Amino acid sequence: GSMQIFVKTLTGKTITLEVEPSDTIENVKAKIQDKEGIPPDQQRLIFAGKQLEDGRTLSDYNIQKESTLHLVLRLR
Amino acid sequence: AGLPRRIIKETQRLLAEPVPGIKAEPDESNARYFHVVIAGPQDSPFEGGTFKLELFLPEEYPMAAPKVRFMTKIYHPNVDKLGRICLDILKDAWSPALQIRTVLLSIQALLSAPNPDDPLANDVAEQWKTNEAQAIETARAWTRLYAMN
Amino acid sequence: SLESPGFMVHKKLKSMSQSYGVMMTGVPAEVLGQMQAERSIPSINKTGNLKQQIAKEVSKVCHMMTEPTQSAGQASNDVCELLLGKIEAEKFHFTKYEALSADGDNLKNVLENTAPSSTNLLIRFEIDREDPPIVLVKTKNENFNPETAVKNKIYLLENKLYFIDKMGNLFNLGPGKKKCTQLFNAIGDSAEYSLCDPFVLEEPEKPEDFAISEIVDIFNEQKERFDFWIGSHSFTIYIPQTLGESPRQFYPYQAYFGSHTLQDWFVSDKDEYLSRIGIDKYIEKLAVLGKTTNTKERSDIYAEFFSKRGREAFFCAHLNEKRQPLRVKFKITEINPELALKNLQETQEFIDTHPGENPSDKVENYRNRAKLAMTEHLESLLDI
């Protein structure tokens, strides 16, 4: 059920992922690694100000097609 | 009535085999809370002091890490305004393979070797790099004032 | 006399990164604020006090938008773009990693099969962890939905034992119907158990503990079948060209999430300290790091190479012990020093358009325009 989400960084860059609502946040970090070379342990993901945890899914956060997550590259 | 076997069996080995320099015992009302006292390590600014720590095991332990906080006010760059501690693991996650013992040991080494270079949002980190020689002594003063008797 | 152009790249990168930190990105301070304001806008509630919540939201993020990234991967990305340019950096990204051979000989051989005086080299590394399953789920076959089961777990059924991996493959772990029968009924009514509780594994009291331990043995016996590697650390090594008969030098560049930045790495001069052991010794310790099964040896080297300077005895002790094996991979390209120095010089021009006599002034000039830009944007989007 390939939908499309976006991942923006502090530099203004947008990244386009092909995902399903089933996949874990860990899975999308691995897709960020495939496009950006960033290891999963080197990144965090935020949705509407809420820190996403690795085991939970995109549906667990009501993340849907065309949503925009924010790549966080310092540790808060 | 019910409380996980891991907590029960770990609490047993914590009182039967405690770590050098640390006292840790369950609260008698809620056995998930722990009254901890750590003797300030030898040849450290906190030598001679005795610092009291509240360790709490959340419902999800040991799948989730415990939460730790200083009850005794202390001068140290890695301590919260409310006394809370990091416990953040670098490029890894808390798994039930790590124990309370490892938590207590890490806090014990954290006193023996403060790390100012971390969050600078509090002043204690600024003084712990600017004039480190003068941060050792004001920590010695807070040891006398709050960590004795 | 003068140094080589390849070495000039190292000197310029390090000294600029030391002094200008967050500005090395080349992104206008205005854009940074507009970006953070986009991330902070939901934390604001229209119903509340607007400015008070804006200032609070600013104050809480004002000093993170404004310092450089900690991500080891992003720092490697930044290094790669400066030394290669956008187009060739993307080409580099899609060339594939190779695993470091058992003694490091494959990387040692490629380095040796290049003339030190002729060439400039960039090595990019990726280090994976092993992230094995850590919980056991006992279901009945009637309650087992293989499509929807949580991944990266071991599942005990009445007559089967599956490892479900991160891509949704169900690997039969081996045991037959009778052995699964024995294990399934040895355990009990809890949904999930830990595969890594030391009190369960080293003090086996009940038949349930002995069964979980036997399942751990069965799994560990077959580990070579599977792939639970997960990307953890990233760093680069720059090897500038020599002049004449001078010996070759290597310089490792890195950042580290939850620890430090490229700027911290350079200011600490740890890149220079590690350089003094020589590339041949470094590779050897990198090979031991992936070859070893000894937790203390793995933790020692990992800290010696990748710790913030000063924290070597502390970076990998207690909660940070390296208890799982590691995999070291690399890839190699030549850089053109003319392109690299150009890229650095353009960044220098961007830095110089910022008011300030000293570098500290220009940094502070940048940081403040970012704070102002965030506040001003948030006001606009709330229609104030």
Coordinates of C-alpha atoms in Angstrom, one line a residue:
Chain A
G1 CA 0.0 0.0 0.0
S2 CA 2.8 2.4 -1.0
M3 CA 1.9 5.9 0.1
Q4 CA 4.3 8.8 0.1
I5 CA 5.7 10.8 3.1
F6 CA 8.3 13.6 3.3
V7 CA 11.2 14.2 5.6
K8 CA 12.6 17.7 6.0
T9 CA 15.8 18.8 7.6
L10 CA 16.9 22.1 9.2
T11 CA 18.6 22.9 5.9
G12 CA 15.3 23.0 4.0
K13 CA 15.9 19.7 2.2
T14 CA 12.9 17.4 1.5
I15 CA 13.2 13.6 1.1
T16 CA 10.5 11.4 -0.4
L17 CA 9.9 8.0 1.1
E18 CA 7.7 5.1 -0.2
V19 CA 6.2 3.5 2.9
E20 CA 3.1 1.7 4.2
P21 CA 1.1 2.6 7.4
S22 CA 2.3 -0.7 8.7
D23 CA 6.0 0.0 8.8
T24 CA 7.9 0.8 12.0
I25 CA 9.7 4.1 12.6
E26 CA 12.8 2.0 12.5
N27 CA 11.9 0.9 9.0
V28 CA 11.6 4.5 7.8
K29 CA 15.0 5.4 9.5
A30 CA 16.5 2.6 7.4
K31 CA 14.9 4.2 4.3
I32 CA 16.5 7.5 5.3
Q33 CA 19.8 5.7 5.5
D34 CA 19.3 4.3 1.9
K35 CA 18.8 7.8 0.5
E36 CA 21.0 9.9 2.8
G37 CA 23.7 7.6 4.2
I38 CA 22.6 8.5 7.7
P39 CA 22.8 5.5 10.1
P40 CA 19.5 4.9 12.1
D41 CA 21.3 5.6 15.4
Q42 CA 22.3 9.0 14.0
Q43 CA 18.8 10.4 13.6
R44 CA 15.5 11.0 15.3
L45 CA 12.1 11.7 13.7
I46 CA 9.4 14.2 14.9
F47 CA 5.8 14.5 13.8
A48 CA 3.8 17.6 14.9
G49 CA 6.2 18.2 17.8
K50 CA 6.0 14.6 19.1
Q51 CA 9.1 12.4 19.2
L52 CA 8.5 9.1 17.4
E53 CA 9.7 5.9 19.0
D54 CA 11.3 3.2 17.0
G55 CA 9.0 0.2 17.6
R56 CA 5.7 2.1 17.0
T57 CA 4.2 2.3 13.5
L58 CA 3.2 5.2 11.2
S59 CA -0.5 4.4 11.9
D60 CA 0.2 4.4 15.6
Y61 CA 0.9 8.1 15.1
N62 CA -1.9 8.8 12.5
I63 CA 0.8 9.5 9.9
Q64 CA -0.8 9.3 6.5
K65 CA 0.0 9.8 2.8
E66 CA 1.7 13.2 2.1
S67 CA 2.6 13.8 5.8
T68 CA 5.8 15.6 6.7
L69 CA 8.1 14.3 9.4
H70 CA 11.1 16.4 10.6
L71 CA 14.6 14.9 10.7
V72 CA 16.3 15.7 14.0
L73 CA 20.1 15.5 14.0
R74 CA 21.0 16.7 17.5
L75 CA 19.8 15.0 20.6
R76 CA 17.0 16.8 22.6
Chain B
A1 CA 0.2 -9.3 45.6
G2 CA 1.7 -9.3 42.2
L3 CA 5.0 -7.7 41.2
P4 CA 7.4 -9.2 38.5
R5 CA 9.8 -11.9 39.4
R6 CA 12.7 -9.9 37.9
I7 CA 12.2 -7.1 40.4
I8 CA 11.8 -9.5 43.2
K9 CA 14.9 -11.6 42.3
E10 CA 17.0 -8.5 41.5
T11 CA 16.0 -6.8 44.8
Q12 CA 17.2 -10.0 46.5
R13 CA 20.7 -10.0 45.0
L14 CA 21.0 -6.2 45.5
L15 CA 20.7 -6.5 49.3
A16 CA 22.6 -9.8 49.4
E17 CA 25.4 -8.6 47.2
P18 CA 25.7 -4.7 47.3
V19 CA 28.3 -2.8 45.3
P20 CA 31.3 -1.2 47.1
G21 CA 30.5 2.4 48.1
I22 CA 26.7 2.3 47.6
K23 CA 23.7 1.6 49.8
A24 CA 20.4 0.7 48.1
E25 CA 17.2 -0.6 49.7
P26 CA 13.5 -0.8 48.7
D27 CA 11.0 1.6 50.0
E28 CA 8.6 -0.3 52.3
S29 CA 5.4 1.1 50.9
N30 CA 6.1 0.9 47.2
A31 CA 8.8 -1.7 46.4
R32 CA 9.5 -0.1 43.0
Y33 CA 11.0 3.0 44.7
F34 CA 14.6 2.7 46.1
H35 CA 16.3 4.8 48.7
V36 CA 19.9 5.0 47.6
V37 CA 23.0 6.5 49.3
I38 CA 26.3 6.8 47.4
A39 CA 29.4 7.7 49.2
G40 CA 31.3 10.4 47.3
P41 CA 34.2 8.5 45.7
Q42 CA 37.7 8.8 46.9
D43 CA 39.9 11.7 45.7
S44 CA 36.9 13.5 44.2
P45 CA 35.4 16.9 45.1
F46 CA 32.5 14.9 46.7
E47 CA 34.8 12.9 49.0
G48 CA 33.3 12.5 52.4
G49 CA 29.8 13.3 51.3
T50 CA 26.9 10.9 51.2
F51 CA 24.3 11.5 48.6
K52 CA 20.7 10.3 48.6
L53 CA 19.1 9.1 45.3
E54 CA 15.5 8.1 44.5
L55 CA 15.4 5.3 42.0
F56 CA 12.0 4.4 40.6
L57 CA 11.1 1.4 38.4
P58 CA 8.2 2.2 36.1
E59 CA 5.5 -0.3 35.3
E60 CA 7.2 -1.4 32.1
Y61 CA 10.5 -2.4 33.8
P62 CA 12.7 -4.1 32.7
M63 CA 11.6 -3.4 29.2
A64 CA 11.9 0.3 30.1
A65 CA 14.7 1.9 32.0
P66 CA 14.4 3.1 35.6
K67 CA 14.3 6.8 36.4
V68 CA 16.8 8.3 38.9
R69 CA 17.0 11.6 40.6
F70 CA 19.2 13.3 43.2
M71 CA 17.3 14.0 46.5
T72 CA 20.5 15.5 48.1
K73 CA 21.2 18.8 46.5
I74 CA 24.6 18.6 44.7
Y75 CA 26.9 20.7 42.5
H76 CA 27.6 18.6 39.4
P77 CA 27.1 19.5 35.6
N78 CA 25.2 16.3 34.8
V79 CA 22.5 16.7 37.5
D80 CA 19.1 18.4 36.8
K81 CA 17.7 21.3 38.7
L82 CA 15.3 18.7 40.2
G83 CA 18.2 16.2 40.6
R84 CA 17.3 14.0 37.6
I85 CA 20.0 12.1 35.7
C86 CA 20.6 11.3 32.0
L87 CA 20.7 7.5 31.7
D88 CA 20.8 8.0 28.0
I89 CA 22.7 5.3 26.1
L90 CA 24.7 6.2 23.0
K91 CA 23.6 4.5 19.7
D92 CA 21.9 1.8 21.7
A93 CA 18.8 1.3 23.8
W94 CA 17.9 0.1 27.2
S95 CA 17.2 -3.7 27.0
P96 CA 16.5 -6.0 30.0
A97 CA 20.1 -7.2 29.7
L98 CA 21.1 -4.1 31.7
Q99 CA 20.4 -3.9 35.5
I100 CA 19.9 -1.5 38.3
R101 CA 23.5 -2.4 39.3
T102 CA 24.9 -1.0 36.0
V103 CA 22.8 2.1 36.6
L104 CA 24.1 2.7 40.1
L105 CA 27.7 2.0 38.9
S106 CA 27.4 4.5 36.0
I107 CA 26.1 7.2 38.4
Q108 CA 29.1 6.3 40.7
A109 CA 31.6 6.8 37.9
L110 CA 29.8 10.0 36.8
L111 CA 30.6 11.6 40.1
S112 CA 34.3 10.4 39.8
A113 CA 34.5 12.1 36.4
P114 CA 32.0 14.9 35.6
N115 CA 31.4 15.6 31.9
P116 CA 30.7 19.4 31.5
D117 CA 30.6 19.1 27.7
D118 CA 27.0 18.0 27.4
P119 CA 24.0 20.4 27.9
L120 CA 25.2 24.0 28.4
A121 CA 21.7 25.3 29.2
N122 CA 22.5 25.3 32.9
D123 CA 25.3 27.4 34.5
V124 CA 27.0 24.5 36.3
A125 CA 28.2 23.2 32.9
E126 CA 29.6 26.7 32.1
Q127 CA 31.6 26.9 35.3
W128 CA 32.8 23.3 34.9
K129 CA 34.8 24.2 31.8
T130 CA 35.5 27.9 32.2
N131 CA 37.2 27.8 35.6
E132 CA 37.3 24.1 36.4
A133 CA 39.8 24.6 39.3
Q134 CA 37.2 26.9 41.0
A135 CA 34.4 24.4 40.3
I136 CA 36.1 21.6 42.2
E137 CA 36.1 23.7 45.4
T138 CA 32.5 25.0 45.2
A139 CA 31.6 21.3 44.8
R140 CA 33.7 20.6 47.9
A141 CA 31.7 23.3 49.7
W142 CA 28.3 21.9 48.7
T143 CA 29.6 18.5 49.9
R144 CA 30.1 19.9 53.4
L145 CA 26.9 21.9 53.4
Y146 CA 24.4 19.2 52.2
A147 CA 26.2 15.8 52.1
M148 CA 27.4 15.6 55.7
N149 CA 25.1 14.0 58.3
Chain C
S1 CA 58.2 25.5 1.5
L2 CA 54.4 25.0 0.9
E3 CA 52.2 22.0 1.6
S4 CA 50.4 20.0 -1.1
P5 CA 46.9 21.1 -2.3
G6 CA 45.4 17.9 -0.9
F7 CA 46.8 18.7 2.6
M8 CA 45.5 22.3 2.2
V9 CA 42.0 20.8 2.0
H10 CA 42.5 19.2 5.5
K11 CA 43.9 22.4 7.0
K12 CA 41.1 24.6 5.6
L13 CA 38.3 22.2 6.5
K14 CA 39.6 21.7 10.1
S15 CA 40.4 25.3 10.9
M16 CA 37.2 26.6 9.3
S17 CA 35.1 24.0 11.2
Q18 CA 36.9 24.8 14.4
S19 CA 36.1 28.5 14.2
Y20 CA 32.8 28.7 12.3
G21 CA 30.9 25.6 13.4
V22 CA 27.3 25.8 12.5
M23 CA 28.0 28.2 9.6
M24 CA 29.9 25.5 7.6
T25 CA 26.5 24.4 6.4
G26 CA 26.2 27.4 4.1
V27 CA 22.5 27.7 4.8
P28 CA 21.3 31.3 5.4
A29 CA 20.4 32.0 9.0
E30 CA 17.0 33.2 7.8
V31 CA 16.2 29.7 6.4
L32 CA 17.2 28.0 9.6
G33 CA 14.7 30.0 11.6
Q34 CA 11.9 29.5 9.1
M35 CA 12.6 25.7 9.3
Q36 CA 12.6 25.4 13.1
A37 CA 9.5 27.6 13.3
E38 CA 7.8 25.0 11.1
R39 CA 8.8 22.3 13.6
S40 CA 7.7 24.3 16.6
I41 CA 4.4 25.7 15.3
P42 CA 2.2 22.9 16.6
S43 CA 3.6 23.1 20.2
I44 CA 2.0 26.5 20.2
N45 CA -1.8 26.6 21.0
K46 CA -3.8 29.4 19.5
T47 CA -6.1 29.4 22.5
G48 CA -3.3 30.3 24.8
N49 CA -1.0 33.3 25.3
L50 CA 0.7 33.7 21.9
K51 CA 4.0 35.6 22.6
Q52 CA 4.7 34.0 26.0
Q53 CA 4.4 30.5 24.3
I54 CA 6.5 31.7 21.4
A55 CA 9.3 32.9 23.6
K56 CA 9.1 29.7 25.6
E57 CA 9.2 27.7 22.4
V58 CA 12.1 29.8 21.2
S59 CA 14.0 29.6 24.5
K60 CA 13.7 25.8 24.5
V61 CA 15.1 25.3 21.0
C62 CA 17.0 28.5 20.5
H63 CA 20.3 26.9 21.4
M64 CA 20.0 23.8 19.2
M65 CA 18.9 25.2 15.9
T66 CA 22.0 27.2 16.5
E67 CA 24.8 24.7 17.2
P68 CA 26.0 22.2 14.6
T69 CA 24.7 18.7 14.0
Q70 CA 25.8 15.7 16.1
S71 CA 24.8 13.1 13.5
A72 CA 27.8 11.0 12.4
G73 CA 26.1 10.4 9.1
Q74 CA 25.3 14.1 8.4
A75 CA 28.9 15.1 9.3
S76 CA 30.1 12.5 6.8
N77 CA 27.6 13.9 4.3
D78 CA 28.9 17.5 5.0
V79 CA 32.5 16.3 4.5
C80 CA 31.7 14.5 1.3
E81 CA 29.9 17.5 -0.2
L82 CA 32.7 19.9 0.5
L83 CA 35.5 17.6 -0.8
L84 CA 33.5 16.2 -3.8
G85 CA 30.8 18.6 -4.7
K86 CA 27.1 17.8 -4.9
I87 CA 27.0 15.7 -8.0
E88 CA 30.1 13.5 -7.3
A89 CA 29.0 13.1 -3.7
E90 CA 25.7 11.6 -4.8
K91 CA 27.6 9.3 -7.1
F92 CA 29.8 8.3 -4.2
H93 CA 26.7 7.6 -2.1
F94 CA 25.5 5.0 -4.6
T95 CA 28.7 3.1 -4.9
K96 CA 28.4 0.2 -2.5
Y97 CA 30.1 -0.6 0.8
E98 CA 32.6 -3.5 1.1
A99 CA 33.0 -5.4 4.4
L100 CA 36.4 -5.0 6.1
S101 CA 38.2 -8.3 5.6
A102 CA 39.2 -10.4 8.6
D103 CA 42.6 -8.7 9.1
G104 CA 41.8 -5.5 7.2
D105 CA 43.9 -6.7 4.3
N106 CA 41.5 -5.6 1.6
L107 CA 41.6 -2.0 2.7
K108 CA 45.3 -2.2 3.4
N109 CA 45.9 -3.6 -0.1
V110 CA 44.0 -0.8 -1.9
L111 CA 45.8 1.9 0.0
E112 CA 49.2 0.2 -0.8
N113 CA 48.2 0.0 -4.5
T114 CA 48.1 3.8 -4.8
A115 CA 51.0 6.2 -5.1
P116 CA 51.2 8.4 -2.0
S117 CA 52.6 11.3 -4.0
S118 CA 50.2 11.0 -6.9
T119 CA 46.7 10.7 -5.2
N120 CA 44.3 12.1 -2.6
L121 CA 41.9 9.7 -1.1
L122 CA 38.6 9.8 0.9
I123 CA 37.4 6.7 2.8
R124 CA 33.9 6.7 4.2
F125 CA 33.1 4.1 6.9
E126 CA 29.9 2.6 8.2
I127 CA 29.8 0.5 11.4
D128 CA 26.7 -1.7 12.0
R129 CA 25.5 -3.2 15.3
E130 CA 23.9 -6.6 15.6
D131 CA 20.3 -6.0 16.8
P132 CA 19.1 -9.5 17.7
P133 CA 15.6 -10.3 18.8
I134 CA 15.1 -9.7 22.6
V135 CA 11.6 -11.0 23.4
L136 CA 9.8 -14.3 23.0
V137 CA 6.1 -14.5 22.2
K138 CA 4.0 -17.6 23.0
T139 CA 0.8 -17.8 20.9
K140 CA -1.5 -20.6 19.9
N141 CA -1.5 -21.3 16.2
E142 CA -5.1 -20.0 16.1
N143 CA -4.0 -16.6 17.5
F144 CA -1.0 -16.4 15.2
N145 CA -1.4 -13.9 12.2
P146 CA 1.9 -14.1 10.3
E147 CA 1.0 -11.0 8.2
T148 CA 0.5 -8.7 11.2
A149 CA 2.8 -10.1 13.9
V150 CA 5.3 -7.7 15.4
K151 CA 8.7 -8.1 13.6
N152 CA 12.1 -8.9 15.1
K153 CA 10.8 -11.4 17.6
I154 CA 10.9 -15.2 18.3
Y155 CA 7.5 -16.9 18.2
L156 CA 6.8 -20.1 20.0
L157 CA 3.7 -22.0 18.6
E158 CA 2.4 -25.3 19.8
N159 CA 4.2 -27.1 17.0
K160 CA 6.7 -24.6 15.6
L161 CA 9.3 -22.0 16.6
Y162 CA 9.7 -19.0 14.3
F163 CA 12.1 -16.1 14.2
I164 CA 10.4 -13.2 12.4
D165 CA 13.0 -10.7 11.1
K166 CA 12.8 -7.0 10.3
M167 CA 11.6 -7.6 6.7
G168 CA 8.8 -10.0 7.7
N169 CA 10.5 -13.3 6.9
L170 CA 9.5 -16.2 9.1
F171 CA 12.6 -18.4 9.7
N172 CA 11.9 -22.0 11.0
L173 CA 14.3 -22.3 13.9
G174 CA 14.3 -26.1 13.6
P175 CA 12.6 -27.9 16.5
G176 CA 10.0 -30.5 15.7
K177 CA 6.5 -31.0 17.1
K178 CA 7.5 -32.8 20.3
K179 CA 10.3 -30.4 21.3
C180 CA 8.0 -27.4 20.6
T181 CA 5.3 -29.2 22.7
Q182 CA 7.7 -29.5 25.6
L183 CA 8.8 -25.8 25.4
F184 CA 5.3 -24.4 24.8
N185 CA 3.9 -26.0 27.9
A186 CA 7.0 -25.4 30.0
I187 CA 6.4 -21.7 29.9
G188 CA 2.9 -20.4 30.8
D189 CA 0.3 -17.7 30.3
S190 CA 2.2 -14.5 29.9
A191 CA 2.1 -13.1 26.4
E192 CA 5.8 -12.0 26.0
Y193 CA 9.1 -12.9 27.8
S194 CA 12.6 -11.5 27.6
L195 CA 15.3 -13.4 25.8
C196 CA 18.0 -11.4 27.6
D197 CA 17.1 -11.2 31.3
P198 CA 20.2 -12.3 33.1
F199 CA 18.2 -13.3 36.1
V200 CA 16.2 -15.6 33.9
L201 CA 19.2 -16.9 32.0
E202 CA 21.8 -17.3 34.8
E203 CA 19.6 -18.3 37.7
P204 CA 17.2 -20.8 36.1
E205 CA 14.7 -21.8 38.8
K206 CA 11.5 -22.8 37.0
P207 CA 11.0 -25.0 34.0
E208 CA 9.9 -21.8 32.2
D209 CA 13.4 -20.3 32.7
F210 CA 15.1 -23.5 31.4
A211 CA 12.8 -23.4 28.4
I212 CA 13.6 -19.8 27.5
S213 CA 17.3 -20.5 28.0
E214 CA 17.0 -23.5 25.6
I215 CA 15.3 -21.3 23.0
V216 CA 18.2 -18.8 23.3
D217 CA 20.6 -21.7 22.7
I218 CA 18.7 -22.8 19.7
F219 CA 18.7 -19.3 18.3
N220 CA 22.4 -18.5 19.0
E221 CA 23.2 -21.9 17.4
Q222 CA 21.7 -20.6 14.1
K223 CA 22.7 -16.9 14.2
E224 CA 24.8 -17.2 11.0
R225 CA 21.5 -17.9 9.1
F226 CA 20.2 -14.4 9.6
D227 CA 20.9 -10.6 9.2
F228 CA 20.1 -8.3 12.1
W229 CA 22.7 -5.8 11.3
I230 CA 21.6 -2.2 11.9
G231 CA 23.6 0.9 10.8
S232 CA 25.2 2.6 13.9
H233 CA 28.2 4.8 13.3
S234 CA 29.7 6.7 10.4
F235 CA 33.0 8.4 9.9
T236 CA 35.5 9.3 7.1
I237 CA 39.3 9.2 6.7
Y238 CA 41.1 11.7 4.5
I239 CA 44.5 10.8 3.2
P240 CA 46.2 13.8 1.5
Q241 CA 48.9 13.5 -1.2
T242 CA 52.5 13.6 -0.1
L243 CA 55.3 15.9 -1.3
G244 CA 58.5 14.1 -2.4
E245 CA 59.5 11.2 -0.1
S246 CA 57.5 12.3 3.0
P247 CA 55.4 9.5 4.7
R248 CA 51.7 9.3 4.2
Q249 CA 49.3 10.5 6.8
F250 CA 45.6 9.8 7.5
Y251 CA 43.0 11.9 9.3
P252 CA 39.7 10.6 10.7
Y253 CA 36.8 13.0 10.7
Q254 CA 33.6 12.3 12.7
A255 CA 30.7 13.5 14.8
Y256 CA 28.7 11.4 17.2
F257 CA 25.0 11.6 18.2
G258 CA 24.4 12.4 21.8
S259 CA 28.1 13.3 22.2
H260 CA 29.9 15.8 20.0
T261 CA 30.1 17.5 16.6
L262 CA 32.7 17.7 13.8
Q263 CA 33.7 21.1 15.4
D264 CA 34.2 19.4 18.8
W265 CA 36.3 16.7 17.1
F266 CA 38.6 19.2 15.4
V267 CA 38.9 21.6 18.4
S268 CA 39.9 18.6 20.5
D269 CA 42.6 17.8 17.9
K270 CA 41.7 14.1 18.3
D271 CA 41.9 13.8 14.5
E272 CA 45.6 14.6 14.9
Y273 CA 46.1 12.3 17.9
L274 CA 44.7 9.3 16.1
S275 CA 46.7 10.2 13.0
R276 CA 49.9 9.6 14.9
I277 CA 49.3 5.9 15.3
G278 CA 49.4 5.5 11.5
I279 CA 46.8 4.1 9.1
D280 CA 48.2 0.5 9.3
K281 CA 47.6 0.2 13.0
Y282 CA 44.2 1.9 12.8
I283 CA 43.0 -0.7 10.3
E284 CA 44.3 -3.5 12.5
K285 CA 42.3 -2.2 15.5
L286 CA 39.3 -1.8 13.1
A287 CA 39.7 -5.4 12.1
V288 CA 40.0 -6.6 15.8
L289 CA 36.9 -4.5 16.5
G290 CA 34.8 -6.6 14.1
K291 CA 36.6 -9.9 14.7
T292 CA 36.4 -9.8 18.5
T293 CA 33.9 -11.6 20.7
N294 CA 35.3 -10.0 23.8
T295 CA 33.1 -7.3 25.2
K296 CA 35.9 -5.4 27.0
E297 CA 38.2 -5.4 23.9
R298 CA 35.4 -4.2 21.6
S299 CA 34.5 -1.5 24.1
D300 CA 38.1 -0.4 24.5
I301 CA 38.9 0.1 20.8
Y302 CA 35.5 1.7 20.0
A303 CA 36.2 4.2 22.8
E304 CA 39.8 4.8 21.7
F305 CA 38.8 5.7 18.2
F306 CA 35.2 7.1 18.5
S307 CA 35.0 8.7 21.9
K308 CA 34.9 12.4 22.5
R309 CA 38.5 13.2 23.6
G310 CA 38.9 12.7 27.4
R311 CA 36.0 10.2 27.8
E312 CA 37.9 7.1 26.5
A313 CA 37.7 5.3 29.8
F314 CA 34.0 6.3 30.1
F315 CA 32.6 6.3 26.6
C316 CA 32.0 2.5 26.5
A317 CA 31.7 1.4 30.2
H318 CA 28.6 0.4 32.2
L319 CA 25.4 1.3 30.3
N320 CA 27.6 1.9 27.1
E321 CA 29.4 -1.4 26.9
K322 CA 29.7 -2.9 23.4
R323 CA 28.0 -6.2 24.2
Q324 CA 27.0 -7.0 20.6
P325 CA 29.4 -7.7 17.7
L326 CA 30.1 -5.0 15.1
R327 CA 30.7 -4.8 11.4
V328 CA 33.0 -2.3 9.7
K329 CA 32.4 -1.4 6.0
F330 CA 34.1 1.2 3.8
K331 CA 34.3 2.7 0.3
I332 CA 36.9 4.7 -1.5
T333 CA 37.2 7.6 -3.9
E334 CA 39.8 10.1 -5.0
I335 CA 39.1 13.8 -4.5
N336 CA 40.2 16.7 -6.7
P337 CA 41.9 19.3 -4.3
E338 CA 41.0 22.2 -6.7
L339 CA 37.3 21.4 -6.5
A340 CA 37.6 20.9 -2.7
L341 CA 39.4 24.2 -2.0
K342 CA 36.9 26.0 -4.2
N343 CA 34.0 24.6 -2.2
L344 CA 35.8 25.6 1.0
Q345 CA 36.4 29.1 -0.4
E346 CA 32.8 29.6 -1.4
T347 CA 31.8 28.7 2.2
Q348 CA 34.4 31.2 3.3
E349 CA 32.7 33.9 1.2
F350 CA 29.3 33.0 2.8
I351 CA 30.9 33.3 6.2
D352 CA 32.4 36.7 5.4
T353 CA 29.1 38.3 4.3
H354 CA 28.2 38.1 8.1
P355 CA 29.1 41.1 10.2
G356 CA 31.9 40.7 12.7
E357 CA 35.6 41.4 13.2
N358 CA 36.5 38.0 14.7
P359 CA 35.1 34.5 14.0
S360 CA 33.3 34.5 17.3
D361 CA 31.4 37.7 16.3
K362 CA 30.3 36.2 13.0
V363 CA 29.1 33.0 14.6
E364 CA 27.1 35.0 17.2
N365 CA 25.9 37.2 14.4
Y366 CA 24.6 34.1 12.6
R367 CA 23.0 32.5 15.7
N368 CA 21.0 35.7 16.6
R369 CA 19.6 36.2 13.1
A370 CA 18.4 32.6 13.4
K371 CA 16.7 33.3 16.7
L372 CA 15.1 36.5 15.2
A373 CA 14.0 34.6 12.1
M374 CA 12.3 31.9 14.0
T375 CA 10.2 34.3 16.1
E376 CA 9.3 36.5 13.2
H377 CA 8.1 33.6 11.1
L378 CA 6.0 32.1 13.9
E379 CA 4.2 35.4 14.3
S380 CA 3.4 35.5 10.6
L381 CA 1.9 32.0 10.5
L382 CA -0.3 32.7 13.5
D383 CA -1.6 35.8 11.6
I384 CA -0.5 38.2 14.3

